[PDB]
Amino acid sequence: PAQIRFSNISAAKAVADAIRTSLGPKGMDKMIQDGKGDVTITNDGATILKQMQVLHPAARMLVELSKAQDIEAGDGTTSVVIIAGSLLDSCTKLLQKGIHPTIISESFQKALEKGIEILTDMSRPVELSDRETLLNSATTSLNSKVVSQYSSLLSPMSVNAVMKVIDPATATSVDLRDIKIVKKLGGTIDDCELVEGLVLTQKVSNSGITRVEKAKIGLIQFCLSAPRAYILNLVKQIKKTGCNVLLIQKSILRDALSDLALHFLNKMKIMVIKDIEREDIEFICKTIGTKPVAHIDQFTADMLGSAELAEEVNLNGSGKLLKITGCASPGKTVTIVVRGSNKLVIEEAERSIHDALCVIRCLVKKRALIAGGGAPEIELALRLTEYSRTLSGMESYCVRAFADAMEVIPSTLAENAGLNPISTVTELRNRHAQGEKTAGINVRKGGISNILEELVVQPLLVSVSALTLATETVRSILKIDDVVNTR
Amino acid sequence: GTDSSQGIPQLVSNISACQVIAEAVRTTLGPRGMDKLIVDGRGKATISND
Amino acid sequence: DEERAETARLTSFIGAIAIGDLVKSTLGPKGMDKILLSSGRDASLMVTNDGATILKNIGVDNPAAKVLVDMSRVQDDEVGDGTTSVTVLAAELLREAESLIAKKIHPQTIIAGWREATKAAREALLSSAVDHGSDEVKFRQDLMNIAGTTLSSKLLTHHKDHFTKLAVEAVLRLKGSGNLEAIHIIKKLGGSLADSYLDEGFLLDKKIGVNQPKRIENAKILIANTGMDTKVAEIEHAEKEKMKEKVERILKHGINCFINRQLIYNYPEQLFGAAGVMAIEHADFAGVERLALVTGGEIASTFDHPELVKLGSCKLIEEVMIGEDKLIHFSGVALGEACTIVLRGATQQILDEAERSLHDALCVLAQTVKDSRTVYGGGCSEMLMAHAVTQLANRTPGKEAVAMESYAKALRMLPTIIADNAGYDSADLVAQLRAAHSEGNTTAGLDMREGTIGDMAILGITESFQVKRQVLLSAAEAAEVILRVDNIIKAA
Amino acid sequence: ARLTSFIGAIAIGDLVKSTLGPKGMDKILLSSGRDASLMVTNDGATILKNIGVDNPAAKVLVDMSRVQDDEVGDGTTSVTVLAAELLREAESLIAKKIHPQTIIAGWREATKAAREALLSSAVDHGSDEVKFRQDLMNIAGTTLSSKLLTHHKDHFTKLAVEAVLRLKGSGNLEAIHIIKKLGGSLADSYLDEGFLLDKKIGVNQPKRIENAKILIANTGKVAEIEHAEKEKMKEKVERILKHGINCFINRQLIYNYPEQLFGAAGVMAIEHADFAGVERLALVTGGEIASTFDHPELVKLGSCKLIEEVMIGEDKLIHFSGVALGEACTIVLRGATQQILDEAERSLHDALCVLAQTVKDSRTVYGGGCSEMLMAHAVTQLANRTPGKEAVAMESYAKALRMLPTIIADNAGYDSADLVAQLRAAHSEGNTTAGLDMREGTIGDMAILGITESFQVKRQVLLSAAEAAEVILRVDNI
Amino acid sequence: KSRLMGLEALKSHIMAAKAVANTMRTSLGPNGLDKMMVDKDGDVTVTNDGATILSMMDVDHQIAKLMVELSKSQDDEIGDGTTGVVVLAGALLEEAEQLLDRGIHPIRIADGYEQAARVAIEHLDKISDSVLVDIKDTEPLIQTAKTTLGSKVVNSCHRQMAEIAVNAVLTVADMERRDVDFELIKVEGKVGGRLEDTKLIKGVIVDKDFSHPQMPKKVEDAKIAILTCPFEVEDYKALQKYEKEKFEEMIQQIKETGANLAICQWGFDDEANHLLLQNNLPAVRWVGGPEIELIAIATGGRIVPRFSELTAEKLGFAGLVQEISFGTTKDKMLVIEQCKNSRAVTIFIRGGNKMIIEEAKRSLHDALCVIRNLIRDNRVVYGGGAAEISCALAVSQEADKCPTLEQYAMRAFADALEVIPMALSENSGMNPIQTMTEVRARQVKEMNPALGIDCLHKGTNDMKQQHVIETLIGKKQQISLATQMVRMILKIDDIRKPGESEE
């Protein structure tokens, strides 16, 4: 019971301390050639955790925390591991003092909700949509990259895309669902456009007319095959109705539209694009309103999707893209048409636009903002220590044990920035106890000061979600007391 | 470890060899002789006095 | 696979005690979750506070422990929750018995003591199993008590209100005799545990599309054989001709809904819609059984003898779309009993867990609708059994007076471990509860929400008699079954 | 180091366990290989004395049995077995994570109830109520358990019943006296009035003397001062003729020129007896002890009236009769082996000590282990009443009280798991007068069969066993 | 190296063989500790009968293989108490080793045990206080079947179960030849049910399907077939012409012949049977093979699977008109009970436990031996060890007026029989020495031979009031077929094992 709980504690603490130095922007890169040749040179600990050979349960639950924190807010991936590992390390004192893990876990729950309610009103919240502070958070996020010169190229485009559809999803917050994204290799970085409706990037090359104002859309996933019976009837149905733009899928076989049916579908010259992407197929259907139907006898008259302008148009001079407006309910995931001749200006632009998405959905699910970089952790370690002084019973140390485990985030931020960690942490505590909350460690210049002047700030829900997930998994691993193999 | 292939060891080995095969059928002499049980190896139990 | 005398009963007791220890911590509403690895390649590091899935997932090769696992399966299919406590009590009785064999007492005397001790506990359960007025004068909160104590370590604390409301409409309407066939549980993904509400049917929509009407009223409904249609090509073609002759035989009814179980491709569905026929493919077969009695449509292989009016007849069947998901409410059944419950939550284990736990809750509620007598839980009944067996051991002479006393200890070790997994103090409170129960009579018991001695009839922590008698009897019988059996080909 | 203390004490309690009760089986006191040859013994008291005990915690239990030894005599084995059984009970409670101090407090408040529940069944016998005989002969016989001397057991109870008229001042255990020779049997003891030393002047020294005023002597150009010291010891023998005495204790060695000159002056000089008999010579005859005897000139001597020395049947069978306080009722057996020398003396000390406890206070409880079952049921009923963890600590205190009539039934050869449990069940309703009979091996009325035991040894066992338990339980290290 | 032979061979086998007896000597008596049975495959059950224990166990030494071979040749003889043959095997082998310590040749020990058995069986006939009028003994047959069920709560339904037993031995009672044959197999055990639903049906209810799954099952007529007829679009049109042909020739050959309830064992299409249903006659598809005798005896006929030989006097035959739901949650099974009596008779068991199925077949067969031994030889002995103590006293008495060294066999014999009341008293949780010698002293002071060991923990040691009753054939066969194998083991000395390469 205790001998396996201690092994869970030690394994999760060891897998948390393997990425503990990578906290902060000065977090150094790693190299683990474990497995069969992994040259793992990266300063970000999320991809380090995704390549860690993990056999222990409690070591794998923090890898689950990493992906959970990346799903909820997209930032603070190493923080939810370091907080959890320091908490589980601090559980050993409570275990050896005599407290049962149930009391430890419920006192951590009490300390968690106390820390959430302490963080939620010590913020500097935004009052409106406040597009100026969205661009301010973009300067905190979309810059310090190679898209720093593409920051004004990319931030107000997404800001205006949320301005277009302030979409009712999780209390009118930013979903992954504003206006459908595409990306095209080649072009310049300035060749991004904000669209209204469906765009296709793939190569449709029709000499005839694909430019119909009432562009009727179907999704026939029935391609052509090789034994005339189950071959031409869908094209006869096309001649019946007149769906002039239809996205082709090769779900049946490989010869998708052979010249028998291809000239039949080039006697009116339908849009032809094959091998459509499976996760975006259902979003395309949510856009259009047609039915994703492969059975050619299930093609009905109510499968006729709507489109207004459908062209194989050379957008930006040469990009033969198929843009579509005028649908049933278009708008599937926030549009940044990533064009770039270089490859790094493709991938970093799209990755930073996803970063911008995961911070603006953080900025409006919870509409507050704090000064990041070790300041709220010191604030929690002060106020929870006072609360644990007020608290009675065996929980009175555990919340205190919750407090000191909060202190690893500034200290690592003190250590990775080269400062002497313990003295700078307690000097930060002395400054905060008589001064302000926003005092912390400016890692961007390497010095302890008021961060709200030096502008290293973060939305509140990153810290709240990281504390929630870390306390949840610490609670679970404390409650875990038995394992068994051999089913 | 005992090597016996010279002439007096030859005859001594021969008569020890007849003594052991005589002991293999020693008790079965007479009408009320003692039974000996052997098998085939696969489970064919044969009790005999012949 | 032969054994010896001292070794075989010892390793049998060790295997059974190890099984009871592997369901020890997952007991009561303070469960410490064990992790079930199945090493394989990517076995999910699954947490669970329910012990039935542990014993279902334990791969055990000690056959006495396999007998213990099988008796836990008998208790699992009998009542549902409580098999953890049954296995814990059985392994506790075996731990008690091997201490008696350490004192060199014959096992038959141990079984002879345990039998009359079990009979004394069985009548001491009736001594305090008072019938609450939750079905007599129709209290609702005491149905919530009995459907809260067996609902421990579960997800539906929001719509335990809805499950107890289903218990109210079960004692009012859905009693067949306490119908255990109406237990109809569905859910999909997206949201949390606060989305459970009423239905009366399963979730399969009109497979013609939205073109099929909603109110397809009078469903003459059964199972068909093959899809309808118009020298291997010619032999299947003449089969297509005979099957069109068969749709000419089924169209003269005037059906609305139908359940064609086999997978239906295009022109079968087209001639279904041309004949107004529904095609529903391989649902939960217990729900099709509710389509067979609450609605009417039984299972069938062919349909050559039922031809005109020889089907199941109902009044109203619809297939709707609510909440952008396949949510279909078969409103208008002939006998309104199989009220389905639809939820929309997060994980997929609740697809089995809510179904089995509503089966457990409705099983103990069916125990109440046969007999609403109940005792006060929290180990108060266990203290009553231990006290009665202790006094009967103080009266009984002979060697068997030892064998009862350990039995009473096996009762007193039951609420201790629930206190031990509570995190709260165990030995002192169980000792104070025992000393109080000796003279401050049986209305006092243990509460672990505050961790104290208290009046359980005031705090209302009830437990139905028909599950507790079942627990005591099954645990004692399993312990005596393995106690009779010593040294054979018993284990490897 | 708390476990090995329990182990060392449990081993000492086990090495008197199979000698418990008067069906006990003997152990071997083999020793250092010089002359260790053999020693069989049913007496567990002398077993632990000849044990070279290694663990110092077991030495504490040994000296607690030593405290029990000089108190009443027999009772060391019961105290040691009960204390080791309490420790074997307590180490099972320690492994269930209970603090030892709670177990000690539970021992204390359980031992209080077990002490008063002896007083609830305090039955007084008619030898100190209606001047009966056989009721105190029962306790005088069962204190003679694991022994042989049952023929003149009536002579032992005669020395008991003559004590309440002659040899009690306050139940005096100094007027008793035991000696024996070898050759013969149980049927040789009789009434004597002292030690066995004879007249020593020889065939001329007569038997009856007139008056024995009796104390201790001293002793009996360098050669001339040696003759002057001879003149001074010759001055002493002139100073003793004018006394008028007829016996004297001669504690220091003496050859014939002091000796014949003593006896010609009428001085019978008794050469260096053991001082325990000289205690009876000090007041029961009335002749004190000194080192010099210059200053007693007519007044500061001993005081007695008659001392006689006869020779009957192969002994130095001297009957020191006619003393001034005629109370030194001496047993002179002629036993079988050398073992009966200490056995008869120590067994009469053990018997007549609790017989003096009865002539102080003649209350008794029924023996055979039913009093142990009564204390067990009494502490079990108090265990069912009080809350807290200490209610567990009472229950194990019951269990050792179950083990004490168990072991008595165990060394009897009989089964002990059934009828001890049958006695425990029957004692709850078929009240206290029932009990275990070891000789016939059954359950019977102990008050009818008269197998009793003095209260002043049962209280001393039941108190001091828990007293030894609470000391060694509270010790943890070294 | 090593070569085990000689008298040390005889020492090694005995401690081998009695070890097997040491496994089984804890299973003696109804209070014996019953015992699991675990296959190499992984199956698990419980059994108390020692014959199943020895048979389904797999032994390593050839003496134990001989032991289970010979004791399976005792199962046809008695089948009840085959444990005691192994117990006496170990007992006589231990006492024979004790005699071998003094130097007696084992041939002399063997025929001395034979002479002691010739004392034993004849003294068993001397103490035979049997009641021979046990023919119309329907009231003491309750007590006869009572001790067979005594280990369980089956005595609480022995007012059903023991009366099933007495009606079973009533129905099989061929009053002159007195035997259960291979046809009179008395078992239909419905796995699933309760205590009383094991009840009185002398008929055939097998798990085969229906003619039609909604057919009116009321076939009162004895006009009933059993077929050896298998199934053995112009292909399907010719086969459908063969199908309506098979109708108008097999069923019309039936109309010539009289084989109406066509229970076919093989393939068929039920629409021909449905047109038979419109003509109101049944026919079942895909039925089982070897149940033709059990079905056909239900008025007195025998196996008739033929097309043509099933005539109006050798029809498929039916027992007694009753209509109960066979499959409550199961498919309702065949009502093959309408018309007359079943001699090869078979009873309705609805035992939910495999233990109560195993005992109600094999203890009923043991009744079918010992109530056969109420007709074949109506000689009962009061068991419970009383027969063994009464026998052993006379064996020791006949070990006095005989002048040979063979005498020491008989005193070794009688004490070996004392293992039977010892293991009865040991498995019942009492003192094994003192109880048996107290009963022996009670017998040497009171000449009643029905004073045994109180295994049931009832009032007294008198087996009259508790009716612990074996038969004299079951006792004599036990003692004689323990002696005939103790002589067999003692006559075998050298197991020169083949393939075990003697170097």
Swiss-Prot record, chain A:
Which residues does the record list as N6-acetyllysine (modified residue)? Answer: 236, 250, 267, 274
Name the reaction it catalyses.
Answer: ATP + H2O = ADP + phosphate + H(+)
Which superkingdom does the taxonomy of this entry point to?
Answer: Eukaryota
EC assignment? 3.6.1.-
> Binding of ADP: at which residues?
24, 76-79, 143-145, 373, 458
Gene3D superfamilies per the record? GroEL, GroEL-like equatorial domain, TCP-1-like chaperonin intermediate domain
Any GO BP annotation? positive regulation of telomere maintenance via telomerase
- One Pfam annotation reads Cpn60_TCP1
Instruction: Read off the SUPFAM superfamilies from this record.
Output: GroEL apical domain-like, GroEL equatorial domain-like, GroEL-intermediate domain like
Disease annotated for this entry? De novo genetic variants in nearly every subunit of the TRiC complex, including CCT4, have been found in individuals with a broad spectrum of brain malformations, and clinical phenotypes ranging from mild to severe epilepsy, developmental delay, intellectual disability, ataxia, and other features of cerebral malfunction.
Q: What is this protein called?
A: T-complex protein 1 subunit delta
Oligomeric state and interaction partners are given as:
Component of the chaperonin-containing T-complex (TRiC), a hexadecamer composed of two identical back-to-back stacked rings enclosing a protein folding chamber. Each ring is made up of eight different subunits: TCP1/CCT1, CCT2, CCT3, CCT4, CCT5, CCT6A/CCT6, CCT7, CCT8. Interacts with PACRG. Interacts with DNAAF4. Interacts with DLEC1.
Swiss-Prot record, chain B:
Q: Where in the cell is it found?
A: Cytoplasm
Query: Which positions are annotated as binding ATP?
Result: 30
For binding ADP, which residues are annotated in this chain's numbering? Answer: 30
Subunit structure and binding partners: Component of the chaperonin-containing T-complex (TRiC), a hexadecamer composed of two identical back-to-back stacked rings enclosing a protein folding chamber. Each ring is made up of eight different subunits: TCP1/CCT1, CCT2, CCT3, CCT4, CCT5, CCT6A/CCT6, CCT7, CCT8. Interacts with PACRG. Interacts with DLEC1.
Q: Which family does it belong to?
A: Belongs to the TCP-1 chaperonin family.
Q: What disease is this protein tied to?
A: De novo genetic variants in nearly every subunit of the TRiC complex, including CCT7, have been found in individuals with a broad spectrum of brain malformations, and clinical phenotypes ranging from mild to severe epilepsy, developmental delay, intellectual disability, ataxia, and other features of cerebral malfunction.
Provide the function of this protein: Component of the chaperonin-containing T-complex (TRiC), a molecular chaperone complex that assists the folding of actin, tubulin and other proteins upon ATP hydrolysis. The TRiC complex mediates the folding of WRAP53/TCAB1, thereby regulating telomere maintenance.
Protein name (Swiss-Prot/TrEMBL):
T-complex protein 1 subunit eta
* Native source organism of the sequence: Homo sapiens (Human)
Organism classification, top ranks?
A: Eukaryota, Metazoa, Chordata, Craniata, Vertebrata
Swiss-Prot record, chain D:
EC number, UniProt record: 3.6.1.-
Where ADP binds, per the record, is at 21, 75-78, 145-146, 368, 453, 458
* GO terms for cellular component: azurophil granule lumen; cell body; chaperonin-containing T-complex; cytosol; extracellular exosome; extracellular region; microtubule; zona pellucida receptor complex
Q: Which domain of life is it from?
A: Eukaryota
* Molecular function terms from GO: ATP binding; ATP hydrolysis activity; ATP-dependent protein folding chaperone; protein folding chaperone; ubiquitin protein ligase binding; unfolded protein binding
**What PROSITE patterns does the database record attribute to this sequence?**
TCP1_1 (PS00750), TCP1_2 (PS00751), TCP1_3 (PS00995)
Annotated residues that bind Mg(2+) are located at: 74
Which keywords describe this protein according to UniProt?
Acetylation, ATP-binding, Chaperone, Cytoplasm, Hydrolase, Isopeptide bond, Nucleotide-binding, Phosphoprotein, Ubl conjugation
Q: Which residues form a coiled coil?
A: none
Instruction: Detail which positions bind ATP.
Output: 21, 75-77, 453, 458
- Give the modified residues of type N6-acetyllysine: 131, 158
The protein's annotated catalytic reaction(s) are: ATP + H2O = ADP + phosphate + H(+)
Give the sites modified to Phosphoserine: 37
Q: Name one GO biological process term.
A: chaperone-mediated protein folding
UniProt signal peptide: none
Pfam families per the record? Answer: Cpn60_TCP1
Main location per UniProt? Answer: cytoplasm
Subcellular localization, per the record?
Cytoplasm
Complex and partners: Component of the chaperonin-containing T-complex (TRiC), a hexadecamer composed of two identical back-to-back stacked rings enclosing a protein folding chamber. Each ring is made up of eight different subunits: TCP1/CCT1, CCT2, CCT3, CCT4, CCT5, CCT6A/CCT6, CCT7, CCT8. Interacts with PACRG. Interacts with FLCN. Interacts with DLEC1. Interacts with SVEP1.
Q: Which family does it belong to?
A: Belongs to the TCP-1 chaperonin family.
The record's PANTHER family line, in alphabetical order, gives: CHAPERONIN
Record's protein name: T-complex protein 1 subunit beta
- Organism, per UniProt? Homo sapiens
Annotated gene: CCT2
UniProtKB/Swiss-Prot annotation, chain E:
Stated name of the protein: T-complex protein 1 subunit epsilon
Per the UniProt entry, what is one GO biological process?
protein stabilization
Which residues hold Mg(2+)?
80
Cite a single GO MF annotation.
G-protein beta-subunit binding
Q: Cite the binding residues for ADP.
A: 29, 81-83, 151, 384, 454, 470, 475
Broadest EC class assigned to this enzyme:
hydrolase
The gene coding this protein: CCT5
Q: Explain the purpose of this protein.
A: Component of the chaperonin-containing T-complex (TRiC), a molecular chaperone complex that assists the folding of actin, tubulin and other proteins upon ATP hydrolysis. The TRiC complex mediates the folding of WRAP53/TCAB1, thereby regulating telomere maintenance. As part of the TRiC complex may play a role in the assembly of BBSome, a complex involved in ciliogenesis regulating transports vesicles to the cilia.
Please provide the record's keywords in A-Z order.
Acetylation, ATP-binding, Chaperone, Cytoplasm, Cytoskeleton, Disease variant, Hydrolase, Isopeptide bond, Neuropathy, Nucleotide-binding, Phosphoprotein, Ubl conjugation
